[PDB]
């Protein structure tokens, strides 16, 4: 029988799915965490792990059974358990992993396994193409410090979709979540930069809420303005 801790999948576009897994840090309750699976020709690319290696394995199994194409690579959007909690699974599966250079530097401080490869960014925010080879439709943008110093974002070329990770909250959210590692001065402008980077994206995907309109960007930025 399917159970609560099992990952759930939603098709967002012909070649894109959202995976959601409900994980559980002590002190606090369990929370849902989302990433993406993208079909690019004869291969699959992932954005973020699940919050645990077990749930990540269950995703790779689903991918194998439902898509049956090899996962060529994964890009993980910052060094916290929810996005990088499944690095061991990805590496056991032979998947090439990519993260912000900064994420890889923070990973041992945050108790997560670093990605194999480091992305660097121009002063514009855009990934340097020599660090993101054969990314296909994944367009990686560093919007500046927000949720964390290292948080990155991903646009999906040929689609409606951009992925904001834990940077973005949905249009009904009443909080930005945990701010203990947030850059409260830069958060608002970073959210706006993400918006300006992906102006064609009408479907905003994010870590802890279901996909929303571009009003999630505005709503998140205007909550963040109150922190300055
Ligand atoms: O994450 P789920 O797709 O199982 C969900 C949960 C409550 C309402 C709608 C969808
Ligand atoms: O969204 P955060 O990266 O603050 C988080 C959420 C659940 C578990 C660990 C980290
Ligand atoms: O054999 N494995 O790499 C495993 C085994 C169990 C698990 O939950 C995840 C990965
Ligand atoms: Mg683990
Ligand atoms: Mg920490
Ligand atoms: Zn985080
Ligand atoms: Zn998160």
The CATH number of the domain holding residue 149 is 3.60.15.10
Give dist(CA 207, CA 223) in Å, integer: 17
Q: Pairing mode, if any, of strands 96-100 and 117-119?
A: parallel
Give dist(CA 194, CA 162) in Å, integer: 9
Best CA proximity match to 127, nearest among 172, 94, 157, 169: 157
Q: Which residue puts its alpha carbon closest to atom 1 of ligand 2?
A: 166
- Own/partner pairs for 131-134, CB < 8 Å, 24+ apart? 131/98, 132/98, 134/72, 134/73
Ligand 3 pocket: which of 7, 59, 92 to mutate (most atoms within 8 A of CB): 92
- Residue 130's alpha-carbon distances to 118, 119, 127, 133, 134, in angstroms, are 11, 9, 9, 6, 10
Report how far ligand 4's centroid is from the alpha carbon of 103 (Å): 17
Specified resolution (Å): 2.0
Domain that residue 147 falls in = 1-228
Q: How many domains does the chain have?
A: 1
Q: Name the structure determination technique.
A: X-ray
- Residue carrying the six token digits 């999948």: 9
Give dist(CA 81, CA 130) in Å, integer: 27
Give dist(CA 58, CA 89) in Å, integer: 10
List the shell of residues around ion ligand 6, using CB closer than 5 Å. 80, 166
């Amino acid at each position: 029988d399917q159970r609560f801790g099992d990952p759930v999948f939603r098709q967002l576009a012909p070649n894109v799915w959202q995976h959601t897994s409900y994980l559980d840090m002590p002190g606090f309750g369990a929370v849902a965490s989302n990433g993406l699976i993208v079909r690019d020709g004869g291969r699959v690319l992932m954005v973020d792990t699940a919050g645990t290696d077990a749930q990540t394995a269950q995703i790779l199994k689903w991918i194998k059974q439902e898509i049956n194409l090899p996962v060529a690579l994964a890009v993980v959007t910052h060094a916290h358990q929810d996005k990088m909690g499944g690095m061991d699974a990805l590496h056991a599966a032979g998947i090439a992993t990519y993260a912000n250079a900064l994420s890889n530097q923070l990973a041992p401080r945050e108790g997560v396994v670093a990605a194999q490869h480091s992305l660097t960014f121009a002063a514009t925010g855009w990934v340097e193409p020599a660090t993101a080879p054969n990314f296909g439709p994944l367009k990686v943008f560093y919007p500046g410090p927000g949720h964390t110093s290292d948080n990155i974002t991903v646009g999906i070329d040929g689609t409606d979709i951009a992925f904001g990770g834990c940077l973005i909250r949905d249009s009904k959210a009443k909080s930005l979540g945990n701010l203990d590692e947030a850059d409260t001065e830069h958060y608002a402008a970073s959210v706006r930069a993400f918006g300006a980077a992906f102006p064609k994206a009408s479907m905003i995907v994010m870590s802890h809420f279901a996909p929303d309109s571009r009003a999630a960007i505005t709503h998140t930025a205007r909550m963040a303005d109150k922190l300055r």
